[PDB]
């Protein structure tokens, strides 16, 4: 028989439930009264006695809706109907609700009490008894004023709403019906979302965008939406070149308008905590609240909440919500996790690829790659960057093994797709794609090191592996580590060969075919860059037995023996540098 109130400290807003920690970021205190209609006797057992039912007019005073009671009484015609025959509900505004009306609208009501005040009170009423049992999301009650509909919603969290007024105290039975207490005075709903946009002067840039895009027919139509409508002042915070480029292009335009529209009508006093919501374009937004401010992604950019329409709810927003798919590469990458990278592109002359409509894919590494320093701008940097800019617009989820990607600097880089990572040359994808209108940003964990020759060119140009190229020659393996292939050479240095045991180097020297078998064991038949090693991967060697290739604590190991220098790229493989020679 017991109930509870939770109240935010330093406020007036209270939520009247049965018997959540914070709400809109503000701490709560919970206070126990018991449910409207029952009394405390002298002590006894904890709300014993129920009060008698009174009829709907007197029930108004019992719930605390004395202004609604006073206004009803001063019409001389609704009060006798309220205390006589029938079955009724009234969604009765609180005392604070009438006082929160604008002076100009409340004067209009109380100066004509037999028409406009009576019409207002009749619109809050339904000619049948309707409990919150009968209230489910999306349904329309018929009011007693001129058959006008009342919009009610019922959100997951338990908040009932009635024309986007929160229902405060529910289900107070009358002898001829029920009384509900709501916190707004509500009014008739006569316009669709399209029709409001064509009336308000604050939306003339919005109405033209809708007109250019052909979304008028949708916004005239049925079903429920939320419009995060941008004012003219929102469109003026966007620089002219950026905005005209979006609005000019039909795809970018419809992506923009759909990023301002939700699939269900939700309204502001239903928002009590963080709720991720998708727009029609596909982007998730973070809708919260801080005080009585609505917040979008933690920004109090909503200046006018709960503007009502027959096909949904409009909230006015102050900043345009431009999605990734309407942005250029520069707009989607400059104030982000690849900020250091994009500054290097523009300083090295390559900025005009990123700033317009060129269909590109960008491989920009993370900012933690450049924590220890940044390379200087020269010929060699701006040629290397020019090879991180790939022709055509790509999606990484659609890349395939042994795909080749042309750069703007003439190279062809190889896509290697492994089970837990995707790699282009040595570099691997570190975060999700950012798909813009014209180009897409791939987010990388290394600066990439493109191949500059063959496996034999790596080894003959480096003096650590001169005993290895001699063994490769003496096993007849030069001509095949130099033609086209996909190898993984675990290449032992000179000090590895001079480390060899007597019985193993005697098997190396005394038969050229046994030397061929030991060197073919060192060579994988796939390309396995370090970014494609999981916990452990088995790798078929050209001898035929498998190699055990792990990555623990950022060191590649092969059969539990360490790689000193991973990922030296080559036009027909990858070279990893090992410090000793593998056995059998």
Author numbering: 47 to 65, 70 to 634
How did the manuscript describe this experimental structure?
Among the most frequent pathogenic mutations are R124H and R555W, both associated with granular corneal dystrophy (GCD) characterized by the early-onset formation of amorphous aggregates. A striking feature found in both the R124H and R555W structures and involving their mutated residues is a crystal packing interface between the FAS1-1 and FAS1-4 domains of different TGFBIp molecules, where residue 124 interacts with residue 555 in a second TGFBIp molecule (i.e., His124 and Arg555 in R124H, Arg124 and Trp555 in R555W). In the R124H structure, the FAS1-1 His124 is in direct contact with Arg555 through a side-chain hydrogen bond. The side chain of Tyr121 also forms a hydrogen bond with the main chain of Leu559 in the second TGFBIp molecule. In addition, multiple hydrophobic interactions involving side chains of Tyr121, Leu120, Met517, Phe547, Leu550, and Leu559 surround His124 and Arg555. A comparison of all available structures reveals that the R124H mutation has no influence on the structure for the FAS1-1 domain, whereas in both the R124H and the R555W structures, the α-helix harboring residue 555 is shifted relative to the position of the helix in the wildtype structure. The Arg124 and Arg555 residues in wildtype TGFBIp do not permit this intermolecular interface due to size and electrostatic repulsion between the two arginines.
The principal constituent of the protein deposits is one of the most abundant proteins in the extracellular matrix (ECM) of the human cornea, transforming growth factor-β–induced protein (TGFBIp). TGFBIp consists of an N-terminal CROPT domain followed by four fasciclin 1 (FAS1) domains (FAS1-1, FAS1-2, FAS1-3, and FAS1-4).
